[PDB]
Amino acid sequence: SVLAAANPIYGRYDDLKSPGDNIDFQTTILSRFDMIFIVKDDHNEERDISIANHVINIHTGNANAMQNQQEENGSEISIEKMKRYITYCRLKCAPRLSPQAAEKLSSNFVTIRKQLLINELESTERSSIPITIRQLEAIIRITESLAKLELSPIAQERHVDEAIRLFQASTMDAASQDPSLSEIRRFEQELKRRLPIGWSTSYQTLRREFALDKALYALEKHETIQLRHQGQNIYRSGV
Amino acid sequence: DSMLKTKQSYLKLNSSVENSLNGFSHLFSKPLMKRVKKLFKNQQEFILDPQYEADYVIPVLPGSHLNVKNPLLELVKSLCHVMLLSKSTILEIRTLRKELLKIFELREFAKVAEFKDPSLSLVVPDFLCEYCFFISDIDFCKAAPESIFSCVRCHKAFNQVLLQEHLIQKLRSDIESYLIQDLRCSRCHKVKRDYMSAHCPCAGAWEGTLPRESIVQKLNVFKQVAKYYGFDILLSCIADLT
Amino acid sequence: FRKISRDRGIIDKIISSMAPSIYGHRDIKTAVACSLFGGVPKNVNGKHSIRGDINVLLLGDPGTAKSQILKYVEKTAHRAVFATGQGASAVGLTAS
Amino acid sequence: KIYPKLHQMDMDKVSRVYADLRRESISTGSFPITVRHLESILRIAESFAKMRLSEFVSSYDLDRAIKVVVDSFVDAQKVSVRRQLRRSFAIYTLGH
Amino acid sequence: MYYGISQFSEAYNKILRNSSSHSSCQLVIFVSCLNIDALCATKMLSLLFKKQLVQSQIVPIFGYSELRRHYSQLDDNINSLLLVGFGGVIDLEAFLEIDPQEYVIDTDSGEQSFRRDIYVLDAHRPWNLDNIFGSQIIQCFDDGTVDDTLGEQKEAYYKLLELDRKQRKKQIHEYEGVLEEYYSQGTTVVNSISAQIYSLLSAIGETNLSNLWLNILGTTSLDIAYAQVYNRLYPLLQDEVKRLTPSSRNSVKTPDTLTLNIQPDYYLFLLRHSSLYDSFYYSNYVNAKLSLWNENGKKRLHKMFARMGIPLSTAQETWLYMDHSIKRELGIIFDKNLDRYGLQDIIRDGFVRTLGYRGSISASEFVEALTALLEVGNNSAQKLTNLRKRWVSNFWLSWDALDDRKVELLNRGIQLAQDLQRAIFNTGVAILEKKLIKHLRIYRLCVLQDGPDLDLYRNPLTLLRLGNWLIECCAESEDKQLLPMVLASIDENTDTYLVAGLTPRYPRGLDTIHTKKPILNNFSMAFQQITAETDAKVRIDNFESSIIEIRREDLSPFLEKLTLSGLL
Numbered sequence A: 001s002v003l004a005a006a007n008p009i010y011g012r013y014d015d016l017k018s019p020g021d022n023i024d025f026q027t028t029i030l031s032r033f034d035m036i037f038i039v040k041d042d043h044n045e046e047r048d049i050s051i052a053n054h055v056i057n058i059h060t061g062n063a064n065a066m067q068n069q070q071e072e073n074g075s076e077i078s079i080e081k082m083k084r085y086i087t088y089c090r091l092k093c094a095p096r097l098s099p100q101a102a103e104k105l106s107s108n109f110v111t112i113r114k115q116l117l118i119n120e121l122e123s124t125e126r127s128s129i130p131i132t133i134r135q136l137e138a139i140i141r142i143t144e145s146l147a148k149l150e151l152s153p154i155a156q157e158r159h160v161d162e163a164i165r166l167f168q169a170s171t172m173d174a175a176s177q178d179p180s181l182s183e184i185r186r187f188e189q190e191l192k193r194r195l196p197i198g199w200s201t202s203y204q205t206l207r208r209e210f211a212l213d214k215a216l217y218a219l220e221k222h223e224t225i226q227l228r229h230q231g232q233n234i235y236r237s238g239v
Numbered sequence B: 001d002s003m004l005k006t007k008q009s010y011l012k013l014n015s016s017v018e019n020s021l022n023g024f025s026h027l028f029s030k031p032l033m034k035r036v037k038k039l040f041k042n043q044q045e046f047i048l049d050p051q052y053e054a055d056y057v058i059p060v061l062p063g064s065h066l067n068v069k070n071p072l073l074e075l076v077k078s079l080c081h082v083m084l085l086s087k088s089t090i091l092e093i094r095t096l097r098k099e100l101l102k103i104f105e106l107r108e109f110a111k112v113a114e115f116k117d118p119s120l121s122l123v124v125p126d127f128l129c130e131y132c133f134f135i136s137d138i139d140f141c142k143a144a145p146e147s148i149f150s151c152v153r154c155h156k157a158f159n160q161v162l163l164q165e166h167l168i169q170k171l172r173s174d175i176e177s178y179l180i181q182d183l184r185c186s187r188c189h190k191v192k193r194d195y196m197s198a199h200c201p202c203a204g205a206w207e208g209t210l211p212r213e214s215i216v217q218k219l220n221v222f223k224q225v226a227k228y229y230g231f232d233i234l235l236s237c238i239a240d241l242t
Numbered sequence C: 001f002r003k004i005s006r007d008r009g010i011i012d013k014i015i016s017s018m019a020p021s022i023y024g025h026r027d028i029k030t031a032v033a034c035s036l037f038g039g040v041p042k043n044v045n046g047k048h049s050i051r052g053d054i055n056v057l058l059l060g061d062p063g064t065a066k067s068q069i070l071k072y073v074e075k076t077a078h079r080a081v082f083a084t085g086q087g088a089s090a091v092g093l094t095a096s
Numbered sequence D: 001k002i003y004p005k006l007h008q009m010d011m012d013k014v015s016r017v018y019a020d021l022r023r024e025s026i027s028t029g030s031f032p033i034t035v036r037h038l039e040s041i042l043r044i045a046e047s048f049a050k051m052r053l054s055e056f057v058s059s060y061d062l063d064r065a066i067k068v069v070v071d072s073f074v075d076a077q078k079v080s081v082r083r084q085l086r087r088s089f090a091i092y093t094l095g096h
Numbered sequence E: 001m002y003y004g005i006s007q008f009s010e011a012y013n014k015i016l017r018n019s020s021s022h023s024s025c026q027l028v029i030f031v032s033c034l035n036i037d038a039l040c041a042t043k044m045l046s047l048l049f050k051k052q053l054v055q056s057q058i059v060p061i062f063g064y065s066e067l068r069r070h071y072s073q074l075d076d077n078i079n080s081l082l083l084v085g086f087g088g089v090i091d092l093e094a095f096l097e098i099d100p101q102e103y104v105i106d107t108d109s110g111e112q113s114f115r116r117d118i119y120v121l122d123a124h125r126p127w128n129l130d131n132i133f134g135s136q137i138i139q140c141f142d143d144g145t146v147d148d149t150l151g152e153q154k155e156a157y158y159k160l161l162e163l164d165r166k167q168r169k170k171q172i173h174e175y176e177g178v179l180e181e182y183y184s185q186g187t188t189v190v191n192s193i194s195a196q197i198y199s200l201l202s203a204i205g206e207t208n209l210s211n212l213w214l215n216i217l218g219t220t221s222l223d224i225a226y227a228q229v230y231n232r233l234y235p236l237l238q239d240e241v242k243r244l245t246p247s248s249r250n251s252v253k254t255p256d257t258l259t260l261n262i263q264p265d266y267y268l269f270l271l272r273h274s275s276l277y278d279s280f281y282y283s284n285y286v287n288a289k290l291s292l293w294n295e296n297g298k299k300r301l302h303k304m305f306a307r308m309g310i311p312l313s314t315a316q317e318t319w320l321y322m323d324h325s326i327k328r329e330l331g332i333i334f335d336k337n338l339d340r341y342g343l344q345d346i347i348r349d350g351f352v353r354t355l356g357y358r359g360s361i362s363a364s365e366f367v368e369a370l371t372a373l374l375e376v377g378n379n380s381a382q383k384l385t386n387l388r389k390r391w392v393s394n395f396w397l398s399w400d401a402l403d404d405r406k407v408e409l410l411n412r413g414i415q416l417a418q419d420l421q422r423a424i425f426n427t428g429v430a431i432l433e434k435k436l437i438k439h440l441r442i443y444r445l446c447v448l449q450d451g452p453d454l455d456l457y458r459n460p461l462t463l464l465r466l467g468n469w470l471i472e473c474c475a476e477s478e479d480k481q482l483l484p485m486v487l488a489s490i491d492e493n494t495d496t497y498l499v500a501g502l503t504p505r506y507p508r509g510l511d512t513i514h515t516k517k518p519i520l521n522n523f524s525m526a527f528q529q530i531t532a533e534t535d536a537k538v539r540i541d542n543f544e545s546s547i548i549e550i551r552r553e554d555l556s557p558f559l560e561k562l563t564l565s566g567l568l
């Protein structure tokens, strides 16, 4: 197994630049890798406080007490017992997929490939993140591992759902990263002048007025518009 | 009086980063902490001895949601919060607060040493006075009882039945809004737009915009207000809820 | 050492004695003293290891006795190794 | 021969200082403030306790380390926002 | 006097008549957990009643509230109760809400019988006069003190009982003053329960090697705190060992030989299961003799080990694996270089038990392992009850450690003893570095606010072990006068401190005229009087009266009031 730790160029990820600019690794090497996590420093002050408290407990001898107590509680287990359990599970079970799991995996793979195709079409550029048959093999292997850690001889759709969730959380998270602008600006200005500051209108009104319409998502990031009625109503939040 | 004298002296000498008040604490610094020490000794003498708990008793208010283990600590925290309002003297006020906490042997940045508002809020939006046609928002957890049963511009009273009706109206409106809220992702915060979805397509769990804990706190506030002011119909509504 | 340790203000006297032949720059002296004494390397249960050494970077205009400060540190610390600019390759810094 | 311990300390002030450091780094700032930087405060406090031969990190050893860290961060920022950052951080270096 | 030593067999026969009905279980044994001597005594009684097939109930109790709750839950069929290690100082009939009239059956005929007879067995000297004299339900097993030194107390108590003018009031006041000066005295112990039950068993004549070993363990349990009593009782155990041992000495070692021997048992810590260097480094006596908490202490320890000529690696090697040369000349080596450093009192003669090829073991090491198993074997009033549950559970671990078939448990107990000694040593050295002990004119207070492994000291025996460490250390400081110390430990989960009133003791081996006079722990009445007034939510439930739980907020006012109190 390969567990690699790398760093995007410029130290930070530098999401303002293109995702292919931040990663110097070519598509070939990225194709072999199954899961590709991209962690980002949120600088969330409450999260910062939580991490600071955890680290302070780590340093001031509190870790050696709380980890031991929590391990004795049974929700954590020592290194050696995990080692032996992993060995036993790997030497004991080699699960295989159920036909329903196969159908679900095929459907999810087609969905993921369609998503990558539409993303590349919108960007007019091949995505640095490759999604191929090897990715489907990776999902199959993760489903097998999930069934194996439970020692289940056959993989259930619960493992398929969890593997799809993890894939979306890591590989799609990498592939969903984004760095015409004239159309976006025109839409922004026309809705600012038309849609009143304190009022709302249905999304179908914007459709009839007239694309992917990423401008609305960008404005939601700017917190000037907000989709509330399950995406059927855009309200000028007050900006 | 300290800030008044400081402002007068500053104006006399002359005639926000820095205003007329920059050392007003010094007018009472020694008396303040001396009196704090004396009151601390007094309390420690009478914190446990009976017939003084009638003095060391925390009054019950409609907005009461904070437990006070030390009435003197609550007092000093309240004074520190009121004297921290000046932006120019922030450093000297923080130093005075630290010295006051040293009397309690408490750290300056201690969470218990941090002061928070002991009163919640429960406003009735768009309250209308049936005589002068005055539009107001009637709070109960912060507004005084004299300011809630009668109008402001005039002094005519209000209907108890109307107060209970509108309070229950806001309560049921909040309940319905919680029950009719929209879901959104927990990771990219995209609003949920379908009906069948375990999570966001980005593997983000669905979550409501109005937390259940928020409605729990609102119900607790309504129950506290009903019990404090004897709101019979509000208590009936609370009983109907569960 | 035990007697002078109980003295109050020993930190400032130590800081001032980092660069007796170099005027001013008290913060640099304090940082150098902190790195010299260093922290305790924590190791949680043998699983999580925490660096206990302090690394300090001095960015400054030429002729500011930064090189002289480094020379003092080299003469001072128990185990000191000095390398300069391009006169030290990647493998020669760590191992080969 | 000195291995100081951080038993006597207030995690609240350190946590708030680290949170504010990250908040000002992400907002109009270029200095990276990471968990390593939070550990740096404890490391400098340990060095302060070492230089006094103290086996426990006193409150002064923590306040001095916090002041050193915040001053080093502030001096690494541009002068345009340096005054505002110093004004924000002044509430943490109390007593010196 | 209620039951003298010579008439213990009468009580045994009465209990046998009362509850030798195998149809039911009408005899219940109450034992105070966290007390080694009580555990040994209960093991003796359990084996004895296993012999006569008398069904019995064994209930380990931690606090007085538990005792009263269990008695309330106690069924009426049980006509015989046994209290082990407690109940001899408090008003049980008042504590348990007991009157003679409810329990009396077949009142007639100058005699009285009762539907439930309770027999207490503890050696705390403040014998409750209402319990030793003014009741028939409460039955106490006196060790010769009440019948010899409480004659005046007996007369005064009976005068008050019979009397419920001016000279009559004067004599009543005099008698009450005599009774009161008998009271208000620190709780002290003169004898070991194990010795008392062993004497009873010898009167019954059902003794064996195992019971003698249990008596040795129970007596050794009191050596650390009550060494004078240990010296008093040592010859009796020695004579019993000489009597019971078979004449076939020097026999070839078989896997079935169980041999009790009297051999030099030096006053070290886990000598046979730890390195000699660590035994010295962790011995409380040596530590107190050289104050090892300072950096000079370790250097002087190396100085001794060099002076004897023993290599430090050899000293730091495990006891079993040392060279036979040192293992056979340890005695002479100690003879040569012990008086030089004042550690001559380390040399001592004790009892060693060998079970076949399993290796030897000393009584001190065994009782240390048992105490360790007792201590660490595994909103506010709930987690505390869970702590009581765990503490009571550890009693059964220590109990099962007595079985020779569970040596694996004994090894775990030995490891726990080593770890607990390490933790107590490190805590003591840290405290003596930071000088957490604040000397006053009443007591040397010491409160632990924060630090490492503070959750270990909420166990009462752990706090007592730390107290033993610190009191031994301060005892060898001649400059520091005799004065009790107070220890508190905040429980963050419960936000409460554990105040432990302790007592000073004379240095071990320091025998003087005042040493013969025991130190009396007057924290009991002081604690109770301070708690009765000025309600501070204090929890005084331990049978050891000098241990209380106090609110974190009320800790400082409680200590201030105690300083204002001159009772102790």
Ligand SMILES: Nc1ncnc2c1ncn2[C@@H]1O[C@H](COP(=O)(O)OP(=O)(O)O)[C@@H](O)[C@H]1O
Pocket (backbone or CB within 6 Å): C021, C022, C023, C024, C025, C060, C061, C062, C063, C064, C065, C066, C067, C068, C069
């Ligand atoms: N603060 C100072 N006090 C005393 N001497 C100084 C100081 N700053 C610079 N110097 C002198 O300048 C000379 C050259 O300094 P140098 O080590 O080249 O600085 P840098 O490393 O910043 O280029 C040294 O001989 C030193 O004595």
Ligand SMILES: [Mg+2]
Pocket (backbone or CB within 6 Å): C062, C063, C064, C065, C066, C067, C068
């Ligand atoms: Mg230079």
Ligand SMILES: [Zn+2]
Pocket (backbone or CB within 6 Å): B129, B130, B131, B132, B133, B134, B151, B152, B153, B154, B155, B156
């Ligand atoms: Zn009006």
Ligand SMILES: [Zn+2]
Pocket (backbone or CB within 6 Å): B185, B186, B187, B188, B189, B190, B200, B201, B202, B203, B204
């Ligand atoms: Zn999402």
